[PDB]
Amino acid sequence: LESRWPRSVVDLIDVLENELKRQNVSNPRELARKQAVALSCFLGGRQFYIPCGDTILTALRDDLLYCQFNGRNMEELRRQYRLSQPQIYQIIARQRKLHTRRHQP
DNA sequence: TACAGATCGATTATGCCCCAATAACCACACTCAACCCATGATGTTTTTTATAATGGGAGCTGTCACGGATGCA
């Protein structure tokens, strides 16, 4: 029944709304409701799978680390993030080129 | 009145970008020897002594008894 339960829709409104109130946006409840309608029309009937495993959260977790990376602070960014240096080496090199084009398009 | 189908809607398959680790390959470095060259303290060797000095035995060894040469007288 859950696989055919119209319960998720309402779950989308508050998840939207609690963010809008966090972003100090006016009329967050009504704003979230019409957004939920917008999701329903596009996503209606489509087999639509979204990335799991904090996929956007890491890519953002990636960004601010590169902001804190000073070329010497490898170890403290290791402790603060629990990520091991090997991957940090790779992500920092990637973010290097990423922000390289950011600073120099 | 009895018997059929028909679309909404769910589990299953198959493949790959990423990617969170995987391992080799290359880069620069401090600490600890190793040997040498002094300074000097310790070691080793050589030289000289001007009253006069002028021959030991150093402890013997304490004792058997055959044979075969052996060098003489």
Curated annotation (Swiss-Prot):
Induction, per UniProt: Expressed in the intermediate phase of the viral replicative cycle.
Outcome (variant: L64S): No effect on dimerization and DNA binding. Complete loss of dimerization and DNA-binding
DNA-binding residues: 73-93
Keyword Metal-binding found: yes
Principal cellular location given in the protein's record: host cell
Cofactor dependency: Mg(2+)
Boundaries of every bZIP domain copy: 43-64
Protein origin, superkingdom: Viruses
Localization (cell): Host cytoplasm
A GO MF term: metal ion binding
SUBUNIT field: Homodimer.
Entry comment, domain topic: The helix-turn-helix (HTH) motif is involved in DNA-binding. The leucine zipper (bZIP) domain is involved in dimerization.
UniProt protein name: Late transcription activator C
Included range, full protein: 27 to 131 of 140
